[PDB]
Design a protein around this nucleic acid. Structure first.
Length: 231
DNA sequence: CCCGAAAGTCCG
DNA sequence: CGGACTTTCGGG
């Protein structure tokens, strides 16, 4: 597939501002799973802005094409740009994009891309179409893929009073035995966050259900102050 | 300005 | 283990 001119312009502009000195620790921070150009977010967003000002944002007919082509580029900044761009097409995104979003989650996978995709884009879709949750979450949990499993945990992260508690706890129950850091941490996170909405329910859950020690400790990082730590 | 979050390192 | 600290980013 021939590169879209918008993507080529973006690649040229990013590459002209690369910083090899910054790229080295930036890559080590991601455990060297990715090449980096060495461009951090404030400049990366300005550089994207430059290209939009010159070329304009492509027609929505090319939205998914742009994202995939950026996803295929080796340096991590292009996936970060791709997520910035998807946000600009946000009002075109609906439930038919769930498989498209799945595929972004399982390719070039790490906590930075997956955390940017799940509580926002997928979170909004399932909030509007909760009947579709059961068409995906059971598969995600059963899959070998820890990022799909993390997606099942985190898609409700920002739901607050719209949280489905029964569902949340069922999902955690399914994954509480996982020895994977990124799963134990996501469980801790989502519980810590939901505790800001309903501390009593989270407290009761962690005191009476099995969790990895990391999950539990992270869950009660704040609300342990409200209940106390027994001798 | 601040704070809280993800990671990360380092230490007992 | 779990705590102290670090950077970057986003939101008040």
């Amino acid at each position: 597939v021939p590169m879209h001119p918008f993507v080529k312009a973006l690649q040229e502009h990013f590459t002209a501002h690369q910083n090899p000195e910054k790229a080295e620790p930036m890559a080590r921070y991601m455990k060297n799973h990715f090449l980096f150009l060495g461009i951090q977010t404030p400049e990366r967003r300005q550089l994207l802005k430059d290209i939009i000002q010159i070329h304009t944002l492509p027609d929505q007919k090319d939205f998914q094409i742009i994202i995939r082509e950026l996803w295929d580029l080796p340096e991590r900044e292009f996936q970060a740009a791709a997520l910035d761009i998807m946000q600009k097409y946000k009002k075109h995104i609906n439930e038919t994009h769930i498989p498209f979003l799945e595929e972004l989650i399982v390719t070039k996978s790490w906590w930075d891309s997956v955390d940017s995709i799940v509580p926002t884009f997928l979170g909004d879709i399932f909030l509007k179409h909760p009947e579709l949750i059961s068409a995906y979450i059971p598969k995600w949990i059963a899959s070998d893929n820890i990022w799909l499993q993390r997606a099942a945990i985190l898609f409700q992260l920002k739901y607050k009073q719209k949280m489905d508690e029964e569902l949340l706890f069922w999902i955690i129950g399914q994954l509480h035995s996982s020895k994977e850091f990124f799963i134990q941490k996501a469980i801790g996170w989502v519980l810590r966050e939901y505790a800001k909405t309903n501390p009593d329910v989270v407290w009761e859950y962690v005191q009476n259900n099995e969790l990895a020690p990391l999950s539990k400790r992270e869950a009660i990082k704040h609300i342990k102050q409200n209940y106390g730590i027994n001798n």
